[PDB]
Design an enzyme around this catalytic site. Structure first.
Site, PDB file in Angstrom:
ATOM      1  N   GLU A 138      13.209  65.593  19.161  1.00  0.00           N
ATOM      2  CA  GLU A 138      13.003  65.175  20.565  1.00  0.00           C
ATOM      3  C   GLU A 138      14.180  65.738  21.373  1.00  0.00           C
ATOM      4  OE1 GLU A 138      13.530  60.977  21.300  1.00  0.00           O
ATOM      5  OE2 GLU A 138      11.972  60.924  22.846  1.00  0.00           O
ATOM      6  N   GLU A 240      12.937  58.829  33.025  1.00  0.00           N
ATOM      7  CA  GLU A 240      12.912  57.679  32.124  1.00  0.00           C
ATOM      8  C   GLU A 240      13.837  56.584  32.659  1.00  0.00           C
ATOM      9  OE1 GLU A 240      13.887  58.679  28.027  1.00  0.00           O
ATOM     10  OE2 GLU A 240      13.625  56.604  27.347  1.00  0.00           O
TER      11      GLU A 240
END
Length: 272
Positions: A138, A240
């Site tokens: 990621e 985010e």
């Protein structure tokens, strides 16, 4: 590589006209969802245990084609993202030189919880890696964040937020970036709950507009032994928010790709 100079590239620094007329999504998308008349897809992760969140895409014909607004009201790790979806068994180098021009406004310091990220995001797969932990990756290129009670949003986040280890740094697009590698142990992933690695480039001088030379980060990570493998999943612009009540509102998100000579291979959008 030669920096691309094409007339279709929108100058990020003055791309600051508020956009209207979004198409909005208020629930978790369950992965990438293709957008109408667009090469891009969006993804939302919106916990039903938290408050109201949304991602609104500004459409194919304005704001560089990938612009969106997102809002969150007491989320639990809201993620809203929009950009390239790949997942076709190719390494990053297949996609040539990738750039993202951007310009947004956002809510202020301490409106997104204890951690938060703005920038470029995705995953990659590297099944042939000898260390099983490094077979799934990621990744984040962090241009900006919202700070928190303890740290200003003008101060770059570090390993006390991301976890992991500083590997090195380099300078690109007008700032030093600190490169961090972190291992997520038995955590949710695109492959189920497992151990995998995270790669971060943290912009030392946070900003809300500019151009990201995405490929330069990929190259630097690999030189440090942070391999991405041969199956890039996606490359998207992310907001985010760990918690808080806030917003993100892009006037520009423009992805484009060029060859080494600086010829545009892909740009959006597609007489006076």
């Amino acid at each position: 590589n030669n920096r691309p100079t094409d007339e279709r590239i929108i100058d990020p620094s003055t791309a600051n006209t508020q956009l209207t007329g979004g198409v909005c999504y208020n629930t978790t998308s369950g992965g990438n969802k293709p957008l109408a008349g667009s090469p891009y897809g969006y993804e939302t992760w919106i916990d039903t245990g938290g408050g109201v969140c949304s991602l609104c895409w500004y459409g194919a014909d304005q704001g560089g084609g990938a612009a969106f607004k997102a809002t969150w009201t007491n989320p639990h790790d809201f993620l809203g993202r929009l950009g390239y979806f790949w997942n076709e068994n190719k390494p990053y180098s297949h996609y040539e030189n990738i750039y993202c021009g951007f310009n947004y406004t956002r809510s202020g310091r301490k409106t997104a919880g204890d951690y938060s990220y703005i920038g470029i995001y995705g995953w990659s797969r590297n099944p042939s890696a000898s260390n099983s932990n490094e077979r799934l990756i990621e990744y984040y290129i962090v241009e900006d964040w919202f700070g928190n009670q303890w740290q200003a949003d003008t101060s770059p986040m570090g390993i006390n937020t991301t976890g992991g280890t500083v590997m090195g740094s380099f300078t690109v697009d007008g700032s030093s970036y600190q490169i961090i590698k972190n291992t997520r142990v038995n955590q949710p992933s695109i492959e189920g709950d497992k151990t995998f690695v995270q790669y971060f480039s943290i912009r030392q001088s946070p900003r809300k507009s500019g151009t990201i030379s995405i490929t330069e980060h990929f190259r630097k990570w690999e030189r440090l032994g942070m391999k991405l493998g041969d199956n890039m999943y996606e490359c998207k612009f992310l907001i985010e928010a760990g918690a808080g009540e806030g917003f993100f509102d892009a006037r520009l998100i423009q992805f484009y790709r060029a060859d080494n000579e600086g010829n545009i291979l892909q740009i959006t959008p597609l007489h006076h």
